[PDB]
Every structure is written in C-alpha cells, then in structure tokens.
Design a protein around this ligand. Structure first.
Ligand SMILES: CC(C)(COP(=O)(O)OP(=O)(O)OC[C@H]1O[C@@H](n2cnc3c(N)ncnc32)[C@H](O)[C@@H]1OP(=O)(O)O)[C@@H](O)C(=O)NCCC(=O)NCCS
Length: 434
C-alpha cells in the first residue's frame, strides 16, 4: 500500500571518466537484468536527527564517483555483444511513503506484493534509457524504513553489487572506502584476445551444451508457461549435520574433506526435485551452480574487481540415477563440477564464449527437468548502516537460492521456485527423505 512516490535522477558528484567501456564475456552472458535486494530498518532512535532521504541521495552521488560505470548506459554491438557507455547519465532514486506498518508484514522473505517497495524496470524500453542502478527508500507509517536496491547483472555479479552497496553505507557514515574498486576489465580480457593457449583446449564443458528438454517434447515452451511458486524452507543446524554425515558416509565423498553445506544441500535438492517431478528414469537433468572465479584464476582477480566474475557451471545426470543412488552420489556430482573450475577451465570457458557467433542464446532469465541452485551463503549482505542503525532484515527477491539464516548461525533457508504441481511432493521429500 503506497501513498506517495517521487523519482529523481542521481549523477556522480564530480566529473568522471567518460567514454566507451568494453565488457568481459561473463558480463554479456547469463543474467543481464537487475539483482534486487531489500533492507528493512526499525524507526531510527531519537538520537538521529539527520535527513534519511537526503543522506541517501548525497552519499549515492558521492559513491558514484568511485563506481562511475554504474551511472552509464548499455549499447548493443554486433553479434549479441554489448558494451558500456560511461556517460554519467545517472541512476534512478525513488522516495516513497506507505500507510502500512512494519508490523503488517507477515514475515520477511523474498515474497511478492513487495513490488510497491522495488523500483520496477521496463526491459522493452530502448537500452540507453534503462538505468543500471535503481533504489527506492520507503517510509512506513510508524517510522520503519525499507530500502530496495536493484543493480544490473549485465555490469556486476552479486559480489560486486554488494560491494557497491556496502561502500554506499560507509560513505553515508562519512568514513573512507573499505576496498577501492578495480574498474579496468582488461584484466579479464574485455574486448581483447586471450593469451595463446600452451596446449590446445578441449571444449567439453557441460555448460556449453543446451539444457535437455523433457523426453517427450522438442522445445520447452509448455514447461516455461506453467504456474510456479516460491516457498521458504528452513534447514536447522542439526538437519544439516544429518544430511552432511549421511553424504560423507558415501564412498563418493572426499576423505579428509567432507562435503560442504552447499554441496550437500544442492545434492539433496536435486534428488528431491527429481523425486517430485515423476520423470522417466532416463530423463536427462542438469543443475546450474554459480561459481565466483575471482580467487579461482591464477593470477587471481584484483581485490575489489568490479564486474561479472561469476560463471554458471553445469552438473548433469539422469533422474533415475539421482533418485536411485544414495545422497553422496548427487553431492559428488556437484562437488566434482566445482573442483573442475581451475584457471585453465575458466580460460577455456572465456575462449568458448569469445568464439561464439551470437551471445543472445546465452542471455535472459532453466526449469523442469533442469535446476539451478545459487549460493548466497558468503555474500557480504549484513550490517548496512547509513546510519540510523543496521537493518533488522535483508534479503534478495528454475533457480533456488541458499540463504544463510540471519538468526541462527550455521542454519540456512532454501528459497525454492518450483511448479505448483510438484511443490508439495518436493517439501515432503525435502524434510522426510533426509
Ligand atoms: C561454488 C561455491 C558455491 C561452492 O561453495 P562451497 O561448496 O561452500 O565451497 P567453498 O570452497 O567455497 O567453501 C568451503 C567452506 O569454507 C568456507 N569458505 C571457503 N572459501 C571461502 C571464501 N573464499 N570466502 C568465504 N568463505 C569461504 C565456505 O563458507 C564453506 O563453508 P561451509 O561448508 O561451512 O558452508 C562457492 O565457492 C562460490 O563460488 N560461491 C559463489 C556464490 C555467488 O557468488 N553467488 C551469487 C552470484 S550473482
């Protein structure tokens, strides 16, 4: 319920480098729409006499000096490629008021009806009118505050978007940058040939293939149209210890290193989805894993590298093998697909994309029979202070998310997007068939 909405354009507070800015291959594939994050704050203490909206606008303007690419626009190039125009056209900031209360919210979680709180984007508009960054602050009726931030995956991954947001808070409190951004995407060979390969590369990565369809049909529009649903499913510390010890008992597990939380939960989720979808045993199925490459390259990417450095790697199996084998088998498929990602693997993946004739077939928003599990377990989300205090909740809006549980260290919450026809069976196996 919204009672006021007023929208402003924010440009950097000082002149900034202007011109044409080429993007890494990872910038131009996968998700190129906006990553949305929500932050909720309690009514500021009586101590606070600053101006909330003005603090936000002013510090955003100052932080855009150091992150000036965020203030630019995209422009299409030939062959599905695109680049950034650093033109300091600016970002959209919205100040809004509501006559709802913080206490009206049933609970806090990526949920719809929150859309009055998020700046909505019209992706059919011409590209040079679409800001890469949109923020909305909303004052509620009893003094609570909400802040949604929406930042293009076409120019950053989630790590770099949260870097931007964190520095925004720091500068609003008047203190210096924690991590200086490294902005030159040439370090990732943006718009440039890779070094020569010593040994010629074998282009055999699973993610180069297109994800399978359901065994009967020949394309996936029928599945794409079906009604889905998001449910939040907690996993307590002890449930995770059970799942993990069960997976480590399998001889596919690594000795001296167990399965991680991500590996275990993701294998469990893949098995549960397979059981719930009632596939024939031969049904191919692929699971997508986001992998941050920053520290996986040699040389590792520079500290504070600002851009997309995350790639989606695929593990694949059949529904019947996943269902019929123990949990450790599935987890070992996840773990093996992750351990494959060495420096050589990354460079071969970039070379593949450089040599593709059209990137449009790797862009825009997967589901049944396939799956994606995005780890949010290490993203520096928490403690964003502008300051009227830290937030009391923050979270994001075929993909499921593994979020940490901000109120019990080590516990997690799966944000699961599945078809309505399969959600009930999924929940049942998720807890029971532990
Ligand atoms: C692929 C990935 C998900 C695998 O995670 P993983 O299976 O936990 O394996 P890791 O090697 O990263 O970490 C092992 C353990 O040490 C911790 N850890 C290891 N390296 C770490 C690092 N560099 N920073 C923080 N924590 C780390 C992890 O939290 C994990 O702990 P857990 O088992 O208690 O959960 C992870 O490495 C990754 O790339 N994360 C990226 C998520 C992301 O960027 N998503 C947003 C995309 S827009």
């Amino acid at each position: 319920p919204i009672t006021f909405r007023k929208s402003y354009t924010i440009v950097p507070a000082e002149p900034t480098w202007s011109g044409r800015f080429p993007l890494a291959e990872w910038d131009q594939v996968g998700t190129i729409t906006h990553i949305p994050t929500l932050y909720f704050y309690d009514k500021p203490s009586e101590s606070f006499q600053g101006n909330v909206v003005e603090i936000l606008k002013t510090s955003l303007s100052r932080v855009l000096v150091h992150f000036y690419p965020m203030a630019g626009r995209l422009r299409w190039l030939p062959r599905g490629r695109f680049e950034l125009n650093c033109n300091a056209e600016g970002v959209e900031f919205i100040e809004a008021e509501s006559e709802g209360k913080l206490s009206d919210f049933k609970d806090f979680s990526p949920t719809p009806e929150f859309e009055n709180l998020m700046p909505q984007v019209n992706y059919k508009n011409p590209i040079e009118t679409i800001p890469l960054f949109l923020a909305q602050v909303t004052k509620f009726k009893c003094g609570g505050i909400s802040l949604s931030v929406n930042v293009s995956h076409a120019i950053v991954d989630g790590q770099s978007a949260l870097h931007l947001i964190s520095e925004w808070g720091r500068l609003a409190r008047g203190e210096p940058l924690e991590t200086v951004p490294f902005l030159d995407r040439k370090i990732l060979w943006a718009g440039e040939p890779l070094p020569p390969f010593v040994s010629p590369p074998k282009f055999d990565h699973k993610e180069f293939d297109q994800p399978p369809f359901l065994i009967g049909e020949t394309d996936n529009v029928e599945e794409r149209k079906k009604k889905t649903i998001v449910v939040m499913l907690p996993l307590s510390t002890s449930q995770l210890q059970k799942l993990r010890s069960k997976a480590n008992g399998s001889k596919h597990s690594d000795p001296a290193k167990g399965f991680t939380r991500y590996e275990t939960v993701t294998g469990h989720v893949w098995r549960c989805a397979c059981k719930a979808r009632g596939h024939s045993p031969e049904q191919p199925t692929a699971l997508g894993i986001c992998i941050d490459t920053r520290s996986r390259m040699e040389p590792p990417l520079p500290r504070g590298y600002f851009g997309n450095a995350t790639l989606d790697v695929v593990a694949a199996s059949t529904s019947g093998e996943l269902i019929s084998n123990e949990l450790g088998f599935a987890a070992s498929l996840i773990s093996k697909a992750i351990k494959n990602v060495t420096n050589e693997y990354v460079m071969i993946g970039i070379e593949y994309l450089k040599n593709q004739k059209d990137l449009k077939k790797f862009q825009d928003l997967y589901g049944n029979p396939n799956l994606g599990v995005v780890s949010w377990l290490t993203l520096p989300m928490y403690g964003l202070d502008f300051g009227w205090g830290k937030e009391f909740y923050t979270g994001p809006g075929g993909d499921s998310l593994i979020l940490p549980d901000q109120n019990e260290d080590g516990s997690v919450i799966l944000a699961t997007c599945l078809q309505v026809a399969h959600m009930e069976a999924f929940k049942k196996h998720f807890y029971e068939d532990i």
